[PDB]
Amino acid sequence: PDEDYWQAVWPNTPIPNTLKELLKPDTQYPKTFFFEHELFPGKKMNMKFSKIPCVREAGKGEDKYCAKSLSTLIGFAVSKLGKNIQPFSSSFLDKQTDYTIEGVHNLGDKAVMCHRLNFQSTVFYCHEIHGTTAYMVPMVAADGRRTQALAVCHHDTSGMNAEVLYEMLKIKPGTETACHFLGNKAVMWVPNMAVNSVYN
Amino acid sequence: PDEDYWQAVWPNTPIPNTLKELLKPDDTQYPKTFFFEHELFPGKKMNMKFSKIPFAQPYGVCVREAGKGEDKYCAKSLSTLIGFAVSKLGKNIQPFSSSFLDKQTDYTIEGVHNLGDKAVMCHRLNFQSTVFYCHEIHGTTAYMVPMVAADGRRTQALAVCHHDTSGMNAEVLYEMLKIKPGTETACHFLGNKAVMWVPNMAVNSVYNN
Ligand SMILES: [Cu+2]
Ligand SMILES: [Cu+2]
Fold first, then answer.
1. What are the CA-CA distances from residue A127 to residues A72, A115, B150 (Å)?
2. How far is A54 from chain B (nearest CA, A)?
């Protein structure tokens, strides 16, 4: 049933294993924050993970939605971005801490983010992004395995706890772009145009 | 017969316009800017310095055929060029080259794509005749660097980081980076006249699976 729904839209594509996993009926949130100029080949990242960062309908806004099934999830994503999109998510590895950045791929500023809520039931809180650039960041871990994670840089750097901006980056709102990674439980939908980059 | 040669190997692909251009039968520009790997990041402001002349050697890397190491070769036709490339890398490869824009100076880096350490570089010599000096690369990582210019146009350039940072004018390392050989990785860009052949594996990156 589920893949039927999917293949109707994107025939001759499977659900990617990341998404396929998130659709099954505690977590880690990466806590590390950084500036854009720290995304470069050879950057050593020591990743700090926290056990702690709809039911709360905060979708007063049309640009926000609370998806309960793959059908509704796709519906919302395409309603904002159209059909030519792919879902991505981070793939931090189980007990690895230290990674080296291999490269940094710009995914642009139009996307939909979906956060898998920690309930047993498949539930995602989905919303559009604004004033923000997304990146895909391939990395190699200490044990030699290669993976990748999604980073988000907020450039309208307002509307956040000035204290944490200061804590992490010794800066206060409005001035400079603050970036952080997303956890494996997030899905981000992105246009195919962005991904192709040079190749299209 | 030109495209026949190509389409025989890669059917339902054209020669890409950059390569197509380089295969046509004076002076060019060599970018002179050098940098460290940690300067390749989103939002880096690059002011590009261009020279009408290389510095002694092509940065640090043939009618004389200083090509007598086998790892080097001197290609005179698209057929020979392809032959050499595939002989070293196999068939599943693409050629890339930089596309600096005519009189632009200042660019912002959008992103940085790792193409790995296996590749073949081909430099189009300045003869009327189609001639390239081709060689394999070693102790070096290649990158594709998308950029937006001051005038708003988007393009991309190839960068090369030498990590076995030997085998170069220590003078220029010092001039540009106030450093001498052996210590740290030195990077620079390639001119629009270079072609680099790269495996498809590298390019796909994540999108392999
Ligand atoms: Cu954020
Ligand atoms: Cu070089």
1. 13, 9, 33
2. 32
